[PDB]
Structure formats: C-alpha cells, structure tokens
Design a binder for this molecule. Structure first.
Ligand SMILES: O=c1[nH]c(Cl)c(CCCCOP(=O)(O)O)c(=O)[nH]1
Ligand SMILES: O=c1[nH]c(Cl)c(CCCCOP(=O)(O)O)c(=O)[nH]1
Ligand SMILES: O=c1[nH]c(Cl)c(CCCCOP(=O)(O)O)c(=O)[nH]1
Ligand SMILES: O=c1[nH]c(Cl)c(CCCCOP(=O)(O)O)c(=O)[nH]1
Ligand SMILES: O=c1[nH]c(Cl)c(CCCCOP(=O)(O)O)c(=O)[nH]1
Ligand SMILES: [K+]
Ligand SMILES: [K+]
Ligand SMILES: [K+]
Ligand SMILES: [K+]
Ligand SMILES: [K+]
Ligand SMILES: [K+]
Ligand SMILES: [K+]
Ligand SMILES: [K+]
Ligand SMILES: [K+]
Ligand SMILES: [K+]
Ligand SMILES: [K+]
Ligand SMILES: [K+]
Ligand SMILES: [K+]
Ligand SMILES: [K+]
Ligand SMILES: [K+]
Ligand SMILES: [K+]
Lengths: 146, 147, 147, 146, 147
C-alpha cells in the first residue's frame, strides 16, 4: 500500500478514546509503508463529513475516527444519523472510500473496549485503516491501466 | 485566534428564553475570538433553519445553527428532528461549509434549559457549536489553496 | 406585513374535516398579513404533497404543506411520514424556497383535531406553518440581492 | 381522466396479495376510461424504484405496487427504508407522481385486509391509482397550456 | 436465458463462512442462467460495498450486493445498516442499474446461517438476490430502446 494517498480525520470529543483510535490507524498506516498520512483534528463527529469532503479531493482514502456516546436525550440518535448520511454521501460524491472508525456506543466502557487500549477487545482505528487501504487497492485495480 | 473568519448565526424562536440563551452563548464566543459582528438571523422554528442556513453559507466561512426541539405528545418530534438533520447535513456538503450543531433535541424542557447556558445550566450548546464552527473554518482555511 | 410575498398552499384531503380546518388557519394568517388570494391546491394524501409542492415552488416565495397522517394498525405510518419528510426537505433546498410544516403526524384522531385550530383546539398548525412560511420568505428577501 | 398515460409496476413477492393489488389498480384505470396502462412485474419491493425510474420517463404517473411483511429479523425495516428513499427520489427527479401502493405490514392478515379482496376492509391498489390519476391531472392544470 | 447480461457481484468478508455461502448461491444461479464468469469483487465489510458497487455499475447491467451484518452490543448495527441502505439505493438510481439486495441484517448468527443457502438453511439469500438482479436487468432491457 506504499503508493496510496491516505487521509485521517479524527474528532476530539472524548480525548483519550480518540487519541487511541488515531494511534491505531497511524500504526497500521506505518506498518503498510505509509509513514506520513494527512492527519486532521476536528472537535466533534458532526464536523467530520465536511473535512472528509475536502480531504477526499486529493487522497485515495479517508479514515473517519470519532466517538459518539449516548447521553440523556435523543441527541445521540441525530448526531449518528448526520454522520452516517454525510460520510455515505461524501464517499459516493468523490468515489473514494471513507472508512468507518466512528464509535457509536451506549457507554464509555464500550468505547474504551473498541479503541485498542492495552486491555480492549478490539481496535477500530486499526480496523478502519485496513478497510480504507484494502478498498483503495481494490478500486485502483478495477480502474484504468495500462 | 479566529478574527478573519466570516461567521453567520441562524437561530430559531420556538422556545424564546432557551433560544435567546443559545444565541447569547454563540455571540459571546464569537466576541471572545475577535468577532464582534457576525451575521445574525432569526427564524420561527427548526424546520426553517436549513433554507436560511443555505442562503448564509453562500458568503460565510461557517454557520452556527441554533434551535430547540422538545418532544410533545405525538411522533412529530421525530420528523422535525429528521428534517433538520437531513437539511443541515445536505447544506454543509452542497456548500462545503461547516454548519455547526447547536440545535437542542430533548425529551423535556428541563433538559433543554440545562443545555442552553442559562445561569444554572450544566452546559452551553450555543457556545460549543460556535467553537466547532470557528475551529473547522480555520482548519479548512489551512487545508485549502494558499501559497 | 407580507403583502408582496407569493404564497402557495397545498393541502391533502385524507381526513377532510381536519384538512379543511388547517387550510382555514393558513388562509386567515395569509389574509391578516395582506394576502387575500394565495395559490391553493388540493391533493389526495400526504404522499402527493412533495411532487405538487415542487411544482408550486417554481413560481412562489413560500409553500405551505398541509395534511394529516394518523397512525393505524401497521408500521405504514412511519414510512408515509418518512417519505413526506425526505421530500419536503429536498424540495425546499432544491428550490431554495421555504416549505412550511403544517403536516400533522399523530397517534389518534383526538390529537390531530386538537392541533387543527377548531374552536376547542389547543393549537392551529395551519396558522403556525403559514406564519413560518411568510416570515422566512421575508427574511430571505432581505438576505438576497437588492440595491 | 382518460387522457393520462399510466404505468403500474408491481412486485411478485407474496404473489396472491400482489395480484389483488394489481387487479384493484386495473379496475380503477378501466373505470376511469384509460388506454390500458403499461404494466411491469418485478420480484420484490427493492427492485421497484429502478423500474419506476424507467417508466417515469414515458408516463404521467406511476403506480407502485408491492407487499412487505415483517419477518424474524430487522430486514423488514431496511427493505421499507430503501423503497421509501427510492420512490421519493424517483418522483422528485422525474417530477412525476409515484403513487403509494406498497403495503408494509406486520402480518399477512393485515396485508390481505388491505388488498381489495371481497372481505377486505380496504383496497390499496385502488387508493394508489386514484392518487396517481388525480395528481397527474392536477399537475397538468398547474403546468403550461392554453 | 441471461447469457447476454453483464453481471457483477460484490461481497464483503465480515463473517467469512456466511459471505462465502452467499457468494456460492449467487454463482450457481448465474451459471444456471448461462453466466459462467461474472465479475466478482471482495470487500472487507458492508460499509465498503456502495463505493465498489458504484464502480462496478459503470461497466455492468446488474450488481449483486452480498454481505452480513449481525447486531452486536452497541447501536452500531443500526448505523451500518442505514449506511448500506442509503448507499446502495443512491447507486442503483444514479446509475439506473439494478443493485440487488443480498445483504443479511440479522440479530443472531443462527439467523444469518439459516438465510445463507447452506445445506440446512431455510432459504438462500445469495440465490435470491441474483435472480432479482438478472430478472430486473432483462426487464429494463425490454423497456429501453431497441429495434
Ligand atoms: O462527537 C460527538 N460525540 C458526542 Cl459523545 C456528542 C454528544 C452525544 C450526545 C450526548 O448528550 P446528551 O444527550 O445532551 O446527554 C456530540 O455531540 N458529538
Ligand atoms: O423548532 C421547533 N421546535 C419544536 Cl419543539 C417543534 C414541535 C415539537 C413537536 C411537539 O408537539 P406535539 O408532538 O404536537 O405534542 C417544531 O415543530 N419546531
Ligand atoms: O395523508 C395520509 N394520511 C394518512 Cl393518515 C395515511 C394512512 C396512514 C395509516 C395507515 O393505516 P394502517 O393501514 O392501519 O397502518 C396516508 O396514507 N396518507
Ligand atoms: O418485496 C419484498 N417483500 C418482502 Cl415481505 C421482503 C422480505 C421481508 C423480510 C422478512 O424476512 P426475515 O426478516 O428474514 O424473517 C423482501 O425482501 N421484499
Ligand atoms: O459488514 C459488516 N458486518 C458487520 Cl456484522 C459489522 C458489525 C456490526 C456490529 C458491531 O458490534 P458492536 O461493536 O458490539 O455493536 C460491520 O461493521 N460490518
Ligand atoms: K479521491
Ligand atoms: K451513557
Ligand atoms: K489504539
Ligand atoms: K461558504
Ligand atoms: K416533553
Ligand atoms: K447562554
Ligand atoms: K493547502
Ligand atoms: K421559488
Ligand atoms: K390510531
Ligand atoms: K383552523
Ligand atoms: K442583501
Ligand atoms: K414523466
Ligand atoms: K410476521
Ligand atoms: K399554468
Ligand atoms: K450500468
Ligand atoms: K447478536
């Protein structure tokens, strides 16, 4: 994957968990021969699609990282609807994979469990970067050459 | 920071005290960041915000959307929140412009009060949404064309 | 006052009595604001509104959507309300024209009656939507080009 | 209303219920004096929008007929979501009424009761055709003419 | 006789054994209808299907979408299914190409196995989706311009 132009946009709402996701994505990127992907920080998940849209203009793949955790109101449902709709539209408008590393949990421990910390069951940042890179390589192979 | 950003704020009026409080928070953040004169526009309800947001996005770096939807006796709340979600999301991507989320969507009036940055509120979504708008605008300025 | 704005109203007919009442509300607000002859068009059910509202938006500053969707025995209500929600939101932004929300989405007949501005009704969604349509039309006029 | 150009697309999943919807639609078009409508069969509700899109290029109105009955899984919800987004989009892209004749029920009993059979409470194939026809005529009047 | 139709199949790999069974059902229908060599592409998860389906749609009469989403401990399952639903629906209509539904969306693994055309499965979702794809391609063929 050393030739792929990779972008990562990570939100900052719930800082420790977001850093963990990013750390996972970067390590997968580096392990695949990419030492310097484009990394951009935004505040919350609502801000990801617009930044992903900009990044997709000149990258083969964008990894979307963030953490939405349910509060006391229906607001959680609408934040996740907005991000779902936006990323989906961005990937199709740009014909570019936007990988899903945006945790959507009922609880904080569930998010921690999926963030790739030493005792976590899995790592979404890593998983989303693999998805982005595999899908970019597939698309490159399907498209025009040579 | 933030003094060159062209900010717009669109605020509904459906629950007066709450709406005015969100708008105050948005405006105080803008002033704190060197923005004394953002474009401020008022609409009746949340459903009116997207079309007005769309107009504003043509000549601003960021738009803050403020409103309050509180659940009543019917499914109506669900559809109002869906319309706004789809609309703001479409607007931000059609215009490549941050549309910051300061629209409260609550089960109770208590909860909305608690999130509007009134004296005894736990938090202020109006202030938070303005931080998001300004920061994303600045990020986009950095990402886009300059030499 | 809105004596210069071009208003259209599209009202469905499924549940006639409540629909006529919504229309009455809409027309009264219109007349009170200086508009005695808005464009009024009738459609069968709520699913017909967006396509007609689309046509009306090409020739008006605001469209008021009126209708009544009352829950039955099946999930069907959800998908009818979903469709109207997506459509009207699309139409408003495609045409950059306010499409005002006067479409009741209720669990019972009692609830729709209570929101249709009949004599003993708690409120009048037709009136409310119409105020939203005109105030938004006027706001947009002030925002857009004039010399 | 004898001058409107009418197309009907019906899915075949739950065949007995689908035919009764179609018969209801056919009776209303015949009673309103139409030149026999363009009638197309598709397998399930999921296929309706893409065929509706084709028919909409050559017709004043499309009647969409189908039956979705909830099963053991959440699949029902997503099937109904797809058809909702699709037809809505098709009607607005083409500026053409796409009438609602898609039953979305919990049980087979409920579908039967809405399919215009002798002991049925309602006739949705009929209801949808009236809506299509009336909306076609309304748009014809709103649009440009002498 | 579908020997003339250009068929693509995109299948995810999340839950490998089940995806493979779905693919096998698809292939068998395809081969039974005269198509020994359809375009087959593997993607990681269901989120990746729309963008690849879009690419396939430029060069094919029909695309079959195969995949498996099984609900976990969080609301994540709902959003993943919302994304796939919206994406595929958008792709079929942008490109006017049948995109057949072979994406399982189940609460349990047991449910998904039962729908995947295994020896003891109640039904075969892969086979079903392919019949839908091919049949819809043929219909569109007769509906469109020919002599
Ligand atoms: O990126 C993000 N993440 C999260 Cl967790 C939230 C808040 C989730 C909503 C919880 O708040 P409550 O519903 O007001 O208690 C957000 O807005 N944006
Ligand atoms: O900006 C807004 N805010 C709110 Cl709270 C509503 C009504 C919420 C619906 C509650 O009332 P009920 O469902 O009729 O009891 C709106 O339409 N537009
Ligand atoms: O404008 C409208 N209004 C209403 Cl109330 C309906 C019926 C929705 C409820 C259906 O009843 P069920 O068939 O028992 O679910 C509609 O289709 N179109
Ligand atoms: O036109 C249609 N109709 C119906 Cl009823 C279905 C399946 C309903 C899904 C129920 O099955 P289960 O959820 O697997 O038990 C479809 O796909 N397409
Ligand atoms: O193609 C797919 N399939 C599936 Cl099953 C998933 C997992 C959805 C369930 C996630 O588990 P949770 O994190 O425990 O909610 C996916 O992301 N992509
Ligand atoms: K790109
Ligand atoms: K929680
Ligand atoms: K990690
Ligand atoms: K702008
Ligand atoms: K309440
Ligand atoms: K405040
Ligand atoms: K730059
Ligand atoms: K207009
Ligand atoms: K009822
Ligand atoms: K009234
Ligand atoms: K102006
Ligand atoms: K047409
Ligand atoms: K059932
Ligand atoms: K005319
Ligand atoms: K094609
Ligand atoms: K499970």
């Amino acid at each position: 994957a050393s030739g792929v132009r990779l972008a990562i946009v990570a939100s900052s709402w719930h800082g420790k968990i977001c850093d963990a996701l990013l750390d996972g994505a970067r390590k997968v990127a580096a392990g695949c021969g990419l030492d310097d992907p484009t990394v951009v920080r935004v505040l919350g998940a609502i801000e990801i699609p617009v930044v992903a849209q900009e990044l997709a203009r000149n990258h083969d793949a964008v990894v979307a990282l963030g953490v939405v955790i349910r509060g006391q109101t229906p607001h959680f449902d609408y934040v996740c609807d907005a991000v779902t709709q936006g990323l989906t539209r961005v990937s199709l408008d740009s014909s570019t994979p936007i990988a899903n590393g945006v945790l959507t949990t009922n609880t904080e421990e569930q998010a921690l469990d999926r963030a790739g910390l030493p005792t976590s069951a899995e790592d979404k940042g890593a998983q989303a970067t693999v998805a982005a890179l595999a899908t970019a390589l597939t698309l490159r192979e399907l498209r025009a050459h040579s």
